[PDB]
Design a binder for this molecule. Sequence first.
Ligand SMILES: CNc1nc2cc3c(=O)[nH]c(N)nc3c(CCO)c2[nH]1
Ligand SMILES: CNc1nc2cc3c(=O)[nH]c(N)nc3c(CCO)c2[nH]1
Ligand SMILES: [Zn+2]
Ligand SMILES: [Zn+2]
Lengths: 349, 349
Amino acid sequence: RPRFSFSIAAREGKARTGTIEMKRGVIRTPAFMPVGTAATVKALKPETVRATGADIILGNTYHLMLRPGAERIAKLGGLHSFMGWDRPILTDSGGYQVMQSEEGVTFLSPERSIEIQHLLGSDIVMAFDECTPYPATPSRAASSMERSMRWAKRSRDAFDSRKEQAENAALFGIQQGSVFENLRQQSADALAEIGFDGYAVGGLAVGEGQDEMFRVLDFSVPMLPDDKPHYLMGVGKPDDIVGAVERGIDMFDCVLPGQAFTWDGPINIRNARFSEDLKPLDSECHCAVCQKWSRAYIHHLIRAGEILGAMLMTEHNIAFYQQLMQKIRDSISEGRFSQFAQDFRARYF
Amino acid sequence: RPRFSFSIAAREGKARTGTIEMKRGVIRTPAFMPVGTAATVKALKPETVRATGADIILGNTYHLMLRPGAERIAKLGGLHSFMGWDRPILTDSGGYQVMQSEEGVTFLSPERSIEIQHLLGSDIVMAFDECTPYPATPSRAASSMERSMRWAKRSRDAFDSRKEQAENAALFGIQQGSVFENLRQQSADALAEIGFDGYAVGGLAVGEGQDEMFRVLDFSVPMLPDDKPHYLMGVGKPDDIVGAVERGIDMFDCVLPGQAFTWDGPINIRNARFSEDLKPLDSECHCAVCQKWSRAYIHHLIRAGEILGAMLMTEHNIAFYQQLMQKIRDSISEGRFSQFAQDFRARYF
Ligand SMILES: CNc1nc2cc3c(=O)[nH]c(N)nc3c(CCO)c2[nH]1
Ligand SMILES: CNc1nc2cc3c(=O)[nH]c(N)nc3c(CCO)c2[nH]1
Ligand SMILES: [Zn+2]
Ligand SMILES: [Zn+2]
């Protein structure tokens, strides 16, 4: 397969569906990336993560840098070998989880972030950025944005200077700018000038609320190169994903999928009303959990603090997200995504 | 299949190998029964428990009686349906975990214990007994033993008076008597007079140490009917199992399989010497964990408090026990068990 190839198979308004081809596999887009904190997707074997339909997972660099150490994982064969996932892995750059000078952060520099991700053997490397607090003054937003762009250039150069990394991995840049249109535009132009394999929209999902996140996406995503993947970092709830895809986003990650997702909205399985409910978590869900166990059982397990409860809840939730992504992909492919988004919402809410 | 049929296919000294046929499946003996506390074998799906080679699991009545309640599980379809295990289940009677009058224990009577196990849908019901503290004075041992035998009769009658239970399930009686030969003999004769499907040796593995446990087994197991299964409750360590089989025991249960069993003895995977060990937990073990992950990875997981660490450690350990039982079964079948026991021990220690 190539190092990196993004192809758009179909479109509807700003939404797109297609594929990212990488040496370790193909990623169907719009994509949801389960989060593996500490070299594991919580409570799931990789084979289970893959059976839910995930094409790619996200590796949490900050934690790995602290344990087991990036150098140790490299000696051990790389993250893929270590945890037993052989498909693409995206690594964040560590800044975000760490939260200060122009050279980096003490507690990590653009150079050391890129090196750590290489040591982990990441397939999609994130540039090292400075996330901007919300809310932010225009001056402070600007300063932070500016630093990040400087750091994006340093990231690019560090990535390119490492031949095995440049030839086998991809590099994504991260747009910053808080909620300010002019700042987002300067950030997009600066990253397009440097040139990246894909473009993340950073600095959102940091307490601004869905209306303001969607308002910023409305002008920010069209500033990014159309022909490259658009990743919204840290999002999110099913409703957020649907609206983000409608605004041109292709890739997502979220941590925490007793809350269970259903097509009728989320439920909390700890609720006493589920103690004798023999129905599965969701009535339509095709996942193994919903094939085999009841609400009543999982209810008991979670209230009992049993590990099988977390295993089963997480498999379901990640399977639900994957099925959501599949329905978004299929509806765009068939040009009925706007109808799917309306039907989804009516029911979900 | 019949309600209950025990057949002995082969023998060597006091050791035996054969099968117990029950309506929900066949149990290969000598058998190890994984323990499901709170209607789950800790950190394992039932399909995983079965893939390790378990033929039967033990259900923990005391906990189930407290949550979710035996009546609730019955309404929900029985323990098998509830937790998704369709093979035989053995239930303890609850006394042991609860730890007082002739009628039962307040905090459970022979009658209520039998009824609860029926409500759970148990395949092998344990009589309700009074476990005797260790150490015990001869007088106190005797009194306790006597009560238990009285309670064994009440258990028998309660079981038999419930037609669906008597026709579909089996009842095991429990020998008591502390470490005193005369008391064990009175206990065995009293239970044989009542008549049971199988005979457990109770009151051991309660701090007496392996030498004294083996000394008591030496005279106690031959007192039980030869043609029925002999169950040693609560045992135990691999070395204990091997010596117990050599003394005529057919069935076992143990809770807690960072400790990992290997044919070279137990290891503690938390030990820093495993942080970069790429070997599997055990060099010969055929389980999925040893096929796929390293010591170094599981080491990281356990130290990180990750749930995948417990899942992987427990699958390995229960698979190891099952492989141990298989090698005991095969060696008796081939009349080389005493040689296997010696080779095992040399290596294990
Ligand atoms: C939960 N919301 C959220 N907003 C984010 C914003 C950023 C960001 O701006 N930059 C980087 N590197 N990471 C981010 C992350 C971690 C994504 O898992 C975010 N996560
Ligand atoms: C861990 N050692 C042990 N000794 C036991 C002794 C007894 C006993 O004497 N009677 C009953 N009912 N249960 C027992 C149990 C629970 C077995 O999981 C024991 N467990
Ligand atoms: Zn499901
Ligand atoms: Zn193993």
